[PDB]
Write a protein that binds this ligand. Structure first.
Ligand SMILES: Nc1ncnc2c1ncn2[C@@H]1O[C@H](COP(=O)(O)OP(=O)(O)CP(=O)(O)O)[C@@H](O)[C@H]1O
Ligand SMILES: Nc1ncnc2c1ncn2[C@@H]1O[C@H](COP(=O)(O)OP(=O)(O)CP(=O)(O)O)[C@@H](O)[C@H]1O
Ligand SMILES: [Cl-]
Ligand SMILES: [Cl-]
Ligand SMILES: [Mg+2]
Ligand SMILES: [Mg+2]
Lengths: 442, 442
């Protein structure tokens, strides 16, 4: 089985993975850049290897160095975390071909869900609801495209299948030019000109379903998260369960997600992201990896998602059955970033003083410590503050109180932004859409 | 109802109470000594009042100053925490007579359970199992006493009803002298000569049952805790549930405890302490207050014990029914003290650096912060590290890992003692008796 794992990541998620490994008795190899020698998890790991200089391209994205680290330590498996190489199919393929277990899905599945057109096709085949669309790539025949767009109903959005690259079209007046432009933009920067159209949903929430699937033919759904509180497509606050979603609706959408996993040969943790609008779900993407906001799911289900990843990768069955899962209570997560709370410019530097919050229903997932220097080279996340309550109101109040106790001295943080969000009367009512934070911020 | 609470305590429990108050929207008054101006909860409280100089006698035990604080702030209720005045019936009486709600039982109930002979009498009346004993005070008639002692079976222990004062007798040879001595010792230092005898249990565990009782006639039991890991009668590690206790046994003893609450007119949180030996429970004391180790119960039941205290004191019913309570998983607590880990001499001074642990299943209840100075004047507790796991083994491993992440720089702590305990193969098996730690320590 898994005796030794390379943690092919950094920051909080590396520490999260280290904690799960140490609970299971799995030895750890921390691969790190020159700039991350003082990361908490590097300091706690069984073995360490420096895989390159500070820039991500030269280190955390350095496929040969990471594989070489697993080779020299005689590791059995590599955990890619989130970001970095976690949804790089070339990496997954090379890890497996080199004799290691990739803690994630197979490369073929990564590629399948990494292409929007093929992802949507598989979701439709599996009975997962999708955005009404062209259902396949669009022609050049404007007459045909004007006809599909009319069928769908304006506004529509043109999307590059290999994008990550979009264009909203609100009238037929614009369509021909728009489809051509998006085709050309996608072909030069992504060497792939394939685009499709789908309905542009103007008032949606981001609701995403957590799954696990093992090598024993099982697949489970673990309720959902609402991640609508975002700026510039970057999440700020997440919660679980999603307000307004009943157990009956959860069973319906969740079971479809679980069947999709089985149809596509999925293995490990993943998330189906939906836009949720006027009471209906519409698939937009599958993240084929663990996610930042996994803790809110753990809080309301009792599941340890990273431990299950490791089990599954070792060849074990998921450690419970669907009937064992019951949503209990409510959870909130605030992503605490080293950044200016109004300009959102990063704020690297020495944390002179850290005071972290605690007590009943308060969880703190962070690699930051007093005396730690937040480097410039990576993202600005320094901590995830997670609260639990028997109700959403309690979770929210607990989050407010925990934030008020939190002290991070030496750098700016976005704590003031979280405080503003949590006291917002619309957020307190629940169910705001994905545009709310930008609208509120002006 | 309760709009404003005086927190008549300090340290971690004061902060625990402050957190519960703030979640409920209850304003807080922090009464503190001159030495505790920089306590975390004093800094967070709505109002503060200095009630005396450093020594406890002059501050936290200063009944007129505490009552005066409630008077001047127009407070509604006083929470005594644990220790200090929490089981002082004179205090409870004066709080109520002065027009405030005492967050605890009535004085008459405090006094009743504060006297061993009357406590045992009430427990027997209620069907709670007690240590076989003289069942009432012992005479001077040695013939009668030798007869009771014989009935009970040596060894016996002679105990002052007002003690807190004991003497073990292993043969009739010693009995007459022993009963006389304990009588005289109790009369001079406690102005009460009343003593009884009971069986001395040589191989017991400390197993205690948590209850709540409200002013609506309800009383619930919330499983039990095993607090056998102690030195010199001071707890080091506690856990819940107690190893070896089945749900059927739990229902039996728990229901008897709940009926006792109703018979005696109990109100609030309390704990029935038992010695548990060869599969049987024997009552030794009721703590008529919240306890240090309350968190392990919260972790395995989902109950917020301090919030329920406040509800009950406001006149509300307990917020759930007995059938709603189900033990889930296992929890451990390590009392982290500022003391030398081998001599146990206190270690006051400045915490230069604090790094607290986190992640899934890790709870940290502490008022300590980097830059905080641990004073000499009070107890040496600085933090409670609490873990949860689906099994006892997981709780234990999580505790080990959390301790390894914990850094308290500037003072000595008992972390090395906890590490030694957690890796002990007998502790890992579970069920060690109250003498084990002293035996292990040599
Ligand atoms: N049919 C549709 N209607 C309305 N909005 C849509 C939409 N399809 C996609 N979007 C929005 O387009 C935005 C950009 O998607 P994006 O390019 O970020 O994909 P991505 O998930 O691969 C990168 P990331 O998830 O990190 O932001 C998303 O916020 C999504 O909400
Ligand atoms: N019948 C009995 N047989 C064996 N041990 C007994 C016993 N009765 C009491 N003890 C032990 O005597 C010890 C001392 O009790 P103690 O005097 O501390 O009462 P107490 O609870 O009011 C003060 P604390 O709880 O803070 O130690 C306890 O550890 C208890 O385990
Ligand atoms: Cl993510
Ligand atoms: Cl206590
Ligand atoms: Mg996405
Ligand atoms: Mg006691």
């Amino acid at each position: 089985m898994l005796e030794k794992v390379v943690i092919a990541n950094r920051g909080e998620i590396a520490l999260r993975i280290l904690r799960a490994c140490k609970e299971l008795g799995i030895k750890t190899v921390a691969v790190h850049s020159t700039a991350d020698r003082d990361l908490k998890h590097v300091l706690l790991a069984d073995e360490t290897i420096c895989i390159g200089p500070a820039p991500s391209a030269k280190s955390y994205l350095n496929i040969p160095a990471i594989i070489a680290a697993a080779e020299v330590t005689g590791a059995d498996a590599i955990h890619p975390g989130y970001g970095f190489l976690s949804e790089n199919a070339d990496f997954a393929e090379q890890v497996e071909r080199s004799g290691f277990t990739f803690i994630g899905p197979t490369a073929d599945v990564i590629r399948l869900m990494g292409d929007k057109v093929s992802a949507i096709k598989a979701m439709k085949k599996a009975g997962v609801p999708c955005v009404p669309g062209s259902d396949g790539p669009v022609s050049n025949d404007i007459a045909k495209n004007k006809e599909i767009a009319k069928r769908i109903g304006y506004p529509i959005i043109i999307k590059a299948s290999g994008g990550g690259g979009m264009r909203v079209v609100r009238s037929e007046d614009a369509l021909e030019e728009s489809i051509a432009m998006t085709k050309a933009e996608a072909k030069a920067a992504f060497n792939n000109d394939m685009v499709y159209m789908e309905k542009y949903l103007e008032n949606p929430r981001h609701v995403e379903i957590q799954v696990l699937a093992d090598t024993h033919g099982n697949a489970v759904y673990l309720a959902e998260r609402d991640c609508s509180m975002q700026r510039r497509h970057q999440k700020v606050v997440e919660e679980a369960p999603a307000p307004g979603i009943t157990e009956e609706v959860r069973r319906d959408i969740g079971s479809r997600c679980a069947n999709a996993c089985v149809e596509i040969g999925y293995r490990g943790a993943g998330t189906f992201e939906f836009l949720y609008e006027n009471g209906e779900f519409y698939f937009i993407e599958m993240n084929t990896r663990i996610q930042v906001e996994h803790p809110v799911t753990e809080m309301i289900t009792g599941v340890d998602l990273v431990k299950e990843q490791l089990r599954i990768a070792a060849g074990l069955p998921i450690s419970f059955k669907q009937e064992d899962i019951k949503v209990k209570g409510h959870a909130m997560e605030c992503r605490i970033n080293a950044e200016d709370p109004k300009t959102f410019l990063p704020s690297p530097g020495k944390v002179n003083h850290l005071h972290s919050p605690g007590g009943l229903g308060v969880r703190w997932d962070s690699h930051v410590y007093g005396g730690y220097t937040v480097p410039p080279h990576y993202d600005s996340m320094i901590a995830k503050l997670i609260t639990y309550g028997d109700t959403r109101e309690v979770a929210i109040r607990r989050m407010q109180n925990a934030l008020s106790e939190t002290i991070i001295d030496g750098i700016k943080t976005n704590i003031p932004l979280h405080e503003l969000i949590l006291e917002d009367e619309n957020f307190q009512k629940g169910g705001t859409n994905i545009h709310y934070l930008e609208k509120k911020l002006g």
